[PDB]
Design a protein around this ligand. Structure first.
Ligand code: HEM
Length: 155
């Protein structure tokens, strides 16, 4: 839904590339996020002592956190927009417990795009980038509506 079937096929095609190495993609996405938008690191109490990129890559804790996030995102993307049941628990924890503004979901979306183009340019051209941008936009729009439903504007 929302996206065309062709757009969803592009999203799931590049996501299959991510699934060949979820841990490595998650590490690189979090490292890119923290370098581009350093304020986001303040949400991760157990990563504050990780001062260098090599320390971040060596942290099993960071790797596990990245796999958990990418696993949840992949499950959502595979619903092709039919993801209300998957977004409700994610909104609850990120609005009320971790306190993640929607802007930080934009920041991580940028990092996802960057890493996927860096690793898979032959499978992530302009049409695929646009499709993934629309899929992440839909995810962010719908989770922002769930934030509000819970009483959080997410600004
Ligand atoms: C694609 C976007 C994201 C997805 C799919 C995602 C998914 C998840 C999942 C599944 C968990 C574990 C269960 C839970 O607590 O809900 C989690 C935990 C967490 N998330 Fe996210 N997340 C995303 C973005 C972010 C961003 C951008 C931040 C902060 C800048 C963030 C901060 C956290 C924190 C601090 C935890 C707890 C980590 C721990 O101590 O184990 N998340 N996330």
């Amino acid at each position: 839904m929302v996206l065309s079937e062709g757009e969803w096929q592009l999203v799931l095609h590049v996501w299959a590339k991510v699934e060949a190495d979820v841990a490595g993609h998650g590490q690189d996405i979090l490292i890119r996020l923290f370098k581009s938008h350093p304020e986001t690191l303040e949400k991760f109490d157990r990563f504050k002592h990780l001062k260098t990129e090599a320390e971040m890559k060596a942290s099993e804790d960071l790797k596990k956190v990245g796999v958990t996030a990418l696993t949840a995102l992949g499950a959502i993307l595979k619903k092709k927009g039919h993801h209300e049941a998957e977004l409700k628990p994610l909104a609850q924890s990120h609005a009320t417990k971790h306190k993640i503004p929607i802007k930080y979901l934009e920041f991580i979306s940028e990092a996802i795009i960057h890493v996927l183009h860096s690793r898979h340019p032959g499978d992530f051209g302009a049409d695929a980038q646009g499709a993934m941008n629309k899929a992440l936009e839909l995810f962010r729009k719908d989770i922002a509506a769930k934030y509000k439903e819970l009483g959080y504007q997410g600004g």
